[PDB]
Amino acid sequence: DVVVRLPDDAFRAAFGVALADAHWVDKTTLLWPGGENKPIVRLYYSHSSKVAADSNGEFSDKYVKLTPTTVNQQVSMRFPHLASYPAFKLPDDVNVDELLQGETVAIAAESDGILSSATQVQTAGVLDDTYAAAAEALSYGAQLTDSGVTFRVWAPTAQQVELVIYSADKKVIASHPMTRDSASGAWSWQGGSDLKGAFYRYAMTVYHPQSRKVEQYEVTDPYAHSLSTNSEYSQVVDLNDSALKPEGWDGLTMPHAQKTKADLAKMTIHESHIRDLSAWDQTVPAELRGKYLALTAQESNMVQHLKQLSASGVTHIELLPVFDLATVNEFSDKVADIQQPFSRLCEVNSAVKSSEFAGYCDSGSTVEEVLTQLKQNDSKDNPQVQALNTLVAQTDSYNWGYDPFHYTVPEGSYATDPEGTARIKEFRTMIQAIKQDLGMNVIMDVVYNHTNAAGPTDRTSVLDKIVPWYYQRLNETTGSVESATCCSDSAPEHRMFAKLIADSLAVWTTDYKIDGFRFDLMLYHPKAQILSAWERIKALNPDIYFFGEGWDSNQSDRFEIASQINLKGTGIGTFSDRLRDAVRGGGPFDSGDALRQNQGVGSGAGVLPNELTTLSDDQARHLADLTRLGMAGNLADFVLIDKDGAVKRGSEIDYNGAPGGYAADPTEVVNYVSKHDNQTLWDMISYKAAQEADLDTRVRMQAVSLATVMLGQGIAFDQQGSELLRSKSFTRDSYDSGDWFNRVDYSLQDNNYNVGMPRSSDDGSNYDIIARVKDAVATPGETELKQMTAFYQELTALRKSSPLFTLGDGATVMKRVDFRNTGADQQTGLLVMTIDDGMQAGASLDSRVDGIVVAINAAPESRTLQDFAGTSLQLSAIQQAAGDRSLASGVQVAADGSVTLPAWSVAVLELPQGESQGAGLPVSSK
């Protein structure tokens, strides 16, 4: 065979290895554009060295000859996005296992044997085709039983793997070379039960394509179930151990059913964060602030508040990242929080010590006291509060935590003791407290769409160190780890990562009794993978609920994505951005004046315009169409009368170019008007409300906005604190904005509004509009916060009171739900929904009523309805009981049966059921 050599340092390097656009997708298939129409196409490989030309300019390294071929159906189906790549066939006798042990490079040469191009090889595909099936049949991690322990880690390309055992003081007590299984590429080691509690890491000797060298490093277990402080070492644990469970743990049951669609529809979520809950509560014992155990402080304002929310209708607590995140140092001596001395901050943060704030280092003030004094002179021209806070954020205990370090171990900073197994029982104690004492189910936010880091050097790179270039999704040409998620994109489409995900979810389900999972950026996951995971988990908990959000994934070229459209009819829920945008107004991408111009139904679009908006009545009514559709579950087939009086199915109501209604059942849709990301509802209302809308009116706008969600058929979701008019001082993306901007005051003194300009890096372009609208009205106080809490609990209580609000089944929604005040002659801003329980709907689902009317008057005028004359409609007892503190205060139900609602009001009316099921409110034929 002609020896490949360089032509006869600059343009010369051009004839070396570059990029990584070669893809070894299966046993004998290599996809690479560089070998097209090339006489010589070879796959060179070196066990311990980097493939390169020798002193003679030749490639003496060993290789395998590749011949032209056409990609088969199998490969085309697995990797559609590479189906256009020139294909090359490898001999059936190639020792795949051996070549995968080192570096492989695709090289193409001309007839004379002169190099034309050489590139690195992406092997994820061949790894799955070769080892996946065998590897999938095995279980991983430090599997400790009473009988002994079996460690197993998947590392099909590693040349060596040793199990390093460490003492409690982190001294090596043993290094065991592991046993490799050729079929699976997995390494195992079996020992005695005396290894219980032992710390360990895997010493890897493996080639990493990024660095092009055989790396040597110790890595924690990707299947770790316990960890040392700050995740430096994994730990052997048996989660079944009674010593790791609170008393009565095994008997813990779900306080809320999730079996039928009707059950699921009652789901009413309170999205919370561990620090957001207790970091500021002085009634929570100091040692428990910012900890899982804060949920057990029954005497605290925070817990008492959650207890009442539960009693009033909130059914689920959704937790922001409580798996092991990487962005918070778990070593307490390296952290400084605002409640501590500024001197402590300077000692742990050199950036602060070298900043303009250095003068506060030897002051006797706490960081919080300094931030407080900086408020008065803070403004768009002197954003000093955020200036100091930005530095504080680098070394505090705060972060949302969407930075996965270990997927199946609880976060350590939220435990009172981050060293070892301690956090496991504490986490369980919290779960038990929420379900048993607070009466709410628990949902965990999971982030399998990306890892905190990748590469052979980053402290937090775990998966990409053990099996390089396999767990991350890479660019087809460069081989760089993609960052479309923000960070280090993962590859859920790869078999062993899909398995890791499912195995992880199984532990949270079985061992931590989590009731549901919310997938972050779910559309970055294949539809098939999410469904397979659900199938596996349902075998463990038949009533587990899966849902997620995204809507921005551009991975459709690689596989069918888990999107709103593709998940229709599957039973997997998705956050709907339809009602969200219609009621809040505008979109998450708005900045500058658009934030104020884009009013929503909740902030008076059309009916109470501010000085900058240009919204037309037509545009306002379109938002109302999206809102009504959402209140009916955002179903693709739901039939309504649109703004122009036309008969339209949900799929026909446009949402920025896409079909508005997309679901098969209302349980596949999660409605909301506020969430951890993007501005809070209150801050949006502050951006959009007309100058003349007073404080009281804005509180009602918050309630009216939330009413579209709470009284709607879709699953109800809301941000912790909406009931307290929560503000982040206009911060749009508060993930690292600390305790200061994320503060929730359970003592009810204020809503954290106007506490300094938000971070300039992300909100600086909004400083102008913020300065102009910020001081329109007074900042909410105890009176307004108590007012809002009452409104909120009134709404959740109403939702909880009747099964008619949560039908669950799409067909049932279509047979019972309808709307009035529709068409061209509608009274703008007035949403009127009817729910039938009469003879024509079928059986009576509520023995107390024959029908319900939901009227949301999102307008500054009193509105009169004649649609129910002669029905004997009555205002719900729940609202009547609230008197002048009700959202229905002032509502009039005359003799003639007409109903009149005051401005910014919400009324739930009922048709009392008598001896037998009555006529009800039959849906009108359209």
CA angle in degrees (0–180, nearest 5) for 568-574-577: 110
Which residue, 109 or 325, has its beta carbon nearer to Ca ion? 325
- Please provide residue 367's backbone torsions phi and psi, each rounded to the nearest 5 degrees: -60, -40
Q: Nearest approach, Cβ of 813 to Ca ion (angstroms)?
A: 17
Residue nearest to Ca ion as judged by C-beta position: 844
Q: Using alpha carbons, select from 604, 667, 575, 565 the residue that is nearest to residue 829.
A: 604
- How far apart, in Å, are the Cα atoms of 597 and each of 202, 315, 592? 56, 35, 9
CB of 625 to Ca ion, least distance (A): 29
Sort 539 into a burial class: Cβ within 10 Å, 0-12 / 13-18 / 19+.
Answer: exposed
- Regarding 399 and contact with Ca ion (CB under 5 A), the answer is yes
Q: Cα-flanking dihedrals φ and ψ of residue 141, to 5°?
A: 95, -170
* DSSP class of 129: I
**Comparing C-alpha atoms, which of 51, 39, 166 is closest to residue 112?**
39
Cβ 866 to Ca ion, closest distance in Å? 24
Binding of Ca ion by 221 (CB under 5 A):
no
Q: Are 512 and 439 in contact (CB under 8 A)?
A: no
Q: Which residues are catalytic?
A: 520, 549
Residue 854's CB is within 10 A of a number of other CB atoms, namely 24
Q: How many residues are present in the chain?
A: 926
Stretch that binds Ca ion, among 97-105, 590-598, 730-738, 772-780 (CB under 5 A): 730-738
- Binding residue for Ca ion, selected from 393, 502, 639, 707, defined by CB under 5 A: 393
C-beta separation of 548 from 572 below 8 A: yes
Least distance (Å) between residue 815 CB and Ca ion: 14
Choose between 59 and 469: whose C-beta lies nearer to Ca ion: 469
Beta-sheet strand order (sheet of 830-836): 817-820, 830-836, 849-857, 905-912, 874-875
Closest to Ca ion by CB, 719 or 844: 844
The answer to the question of residue 32 lying near Ca ion (CB under 5 A) is no
In angstroms, give the least distance from the CB of 399 to Ca ion: 5
116 or 399: CB nearest Ca ion: 399
Packing angle, helices 422-432 and 495-512, rounded to 10: 70
Shortest Å, Cβ 684 to Ca ion: 25
399 and 739 in contact (C-beta within 8 Å)?
no
Binding to Ca ion (CB under 5 A): which residues in 828-857? 837, 844, 846
Alpha carbons within 13 angstroms on the beta-carbon side of residue 164 total: 18
Distance CA 371, CA 389 (A): 8
Task: Output the 3-class SS for 356-376.
Answer: CCHHHCCCCCEHHHHHHHHCC
Q: Decide if residue 398 touches Ca ion (CB under 5 A).
A: yes
Segment 708 to 727, residues that bind Ca ion, using CB under 5 A:
none
108 with 116: CB under 8 angstroms?
Answer: yes
Site for Ca ion in 128-147 (CB under 5 A): none
> By rule CB under 5 A, what count of residues binds Ca ion?
13
Burial state string for 610-638 with b = 16 or more CB within 10 A and e = fewer than 16: bebbebeeeebbbbbbbbbbbbbbbbbeb
Per CB under 5 A, contacts with Ca ion among 672-711 are: none
Q: Alpha-carbon Rg of the chain, whole angstroms? A: 30
- Closest CB to Ca ion among 438 and 911? 911
Residue 409 C-beta: closest distance to Ca ion, Å: 8
Closest CB 411 distance from Ca ion, rounded Å: 5
172 φ, ψ (degrees, to nearest 5): -65, 125
Taking the least distance from each CB to Ca ion, the nearer of 44 and 398 is 398
Closer residue to Ca ion, CB minimum distance, 337 or 750 = 337
Does 642 bind Ca ion (CB under 5 A)? Our answer is no
Residue with tokens 């994934």: 553
Least distance from C-beta 279 to Ca ion, angstroms? 12
- In the region spanning residues 898 to 917, those forming contacts with Ca ion, defined by CB under 5 A, are 913
Cβ 393 to Ca ion, closest distance in Å?
4
Give the HSE-up count for residue 176: Cα atoms under 13 Å, Cβ half-sphere. Answer: 17
- Which is nearer to Ca ion, 230 or 905 (by Cβ)? 230
Per-position x/- string for 408-437, each x denoting binding to Ca ion as judged by CB under 5 A, each - no binding: ---xx-------------------------
Within 10 A of 254 (CB to CB), how many other CB atoms are there? 16
Q: Is 39 helix (H, G, I), strand (E, B) or coil?
A: coil
Nearest residue (CB) to Ca ion, 366 versus 452: 452
Does the protein bind Ca ion through residue 226 (CB under 5 A)?
no
* Least distance (Å) between residue 14 CB and Ca ion: 27
Closer to Ca ion by CB, 376 or 916: give it. Answer: 916
Binding of Ca ion by 736 (CB under 5 A): yes
DSSP string, 650-714: GGGSEETTEES--BSSGGGEEE-S--SSS--HHHHHHHHS-TT--HHHHHHHHHHHHHHHHTSSS
- Contact positions with Ca ion (CB under 5 A) in 352-391: none
Q: What letter does residue 756 receive in the DSSP assignment?
A: S
Q: Give the Cα separation of 71 and 498 in Å (integer).
A: 25
Minimum gap (Å) between residue 846 Cβ and Ca ion? 4
Q: Please, which residue, 492 or 660, has the CB nearer to Ca ion?
A: 492
One character per residue 309-338, x = contact with Ca ion (rule: CB under 5 A): ---------------xx-------------
Q: Determine the interface stretch with Ca ion among 31-39, 55-63, 200-208, 733-741 (rule: CB under 5 A).
A: 733-741
DSSP 235: E
C-alpha 30/C-alpha 25 separation (Å) is 6
Q: Is 788 exposed, middle or buried (0-12, 13-18, 19+ CB in 10 A)?
A: buried
Nearer to Ca ion, 493 or 577 (CB): 493
Q: Which residues bind Ca ion (CB under 5 A)?
A: 324-325, 393, 396, 398-399, 411-412, 736, 837, 844, 846, 913
